[PDB]
Structure 1
Amino acid sequence: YDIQAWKKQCEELLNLIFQCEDSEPFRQPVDLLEYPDYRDIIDTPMDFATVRETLEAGNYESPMELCKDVRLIFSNSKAYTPSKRSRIYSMSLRLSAFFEEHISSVLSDYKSALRFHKR
């Protein structure tokens, strides 16, 4: 029922994501010189370095907020892809599956801890 445990669990999961080859394109903000129309399609750039820095600054209150930003990385990739068969989109789908498999317990444990706190 540790209400704070999610933060180190998220740090460890980001470490695993950074070791995944599939995270390569998502590890820093999209380069606008490589993709000059990127901000005509995508509203809010997110990448994993921005998520890690936000966590490490103490600017997430809950793992739900971190999860929303990670999911934005993946929805941005789906919105920008010209094809569902894209290399970088295909990498996003595998990385998303990996992320969702690991974040599930982090969310469940946090929400259970909060419920216990408010019992």
Structure 2
Amino acid sequence: SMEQVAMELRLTELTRLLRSVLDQLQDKDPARIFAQPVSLKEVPDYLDHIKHPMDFATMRKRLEAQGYKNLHEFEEDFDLIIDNCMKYNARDTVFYRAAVRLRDQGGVVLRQARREVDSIGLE
């Protein structure tokens, strides 16, 4: 149907905007601490601690499959990256501190992304 196509165009448009958001967020992680999933070979007990691992590569996979239906779902996954890190790692670590900085700087980006999704009406 034509209605189904219109919806798919909106989803495609949303995916385009989220791809830009993802690129902007990942630039706030120049150390690339959050680029890839935590290795279970190098951190064998990780899943005992963290029940829902997340990382930028995994987000990008879901994104290109148009698997984010709205901004909230995308933000949930970004929050997982930050929150997982701040639980597993102690305050005095380069990992924890990198997550704080990503959260603070990412807030700016997500604030205007929400305005754009609402304004252009992608959800």
Same structural fold, with TM-score higher than 0.5 when normalized by the shorter chain: yes
Q: How does 1:19-98 map to 2 (within 5 A)?
A: 19=27, 20-22=29-31, 24-81=32-89, 83-98=90-105
Q: Residue 7 of structure 1: which of 5, 15, 19 is its match?
A: 15
Residues 28, 50 of structure 1: 8 Å contact kept? yes
The aligned residue for residue 105 of structure 1 is 112
- Stretches of structure 2 that go unaligned for 5 or more consecutive residues are 1-9
Q: CA deviation at 1:48?
A: 0.6
Change (3 A) 1:110 1:18: closer
Q: Distance in 1 between matches of 2:97 and 2:30?
A: 12
Q: CA deviation at 1:108?
A: 2.6
Q: Distance in 1 between matches of 2:104 and 2:16?
A: 21
SS at match of 1:69: helix
Q: Distance in 1 between matches of 2:78 and 2:51?
A: 15
Q: Distance in 1 between matches of 2:98 and 2:41?
A: 21
What letter is aligned with 1:25?
I
Q: CA deviation at 1:13?
A: 2.5
SS at match of 1:54: helix
Aligned length: 112
Q: CA deviation at 1:113?
A: 4.7
What letter is aligned with 1:106?
A
RMSD: 2.2
Instruction: Work out which structure has the larger RCO, using CA pairs closer than 8 Å and 6 or more positions apart in sequence.
Output: 1
Identity %: 30
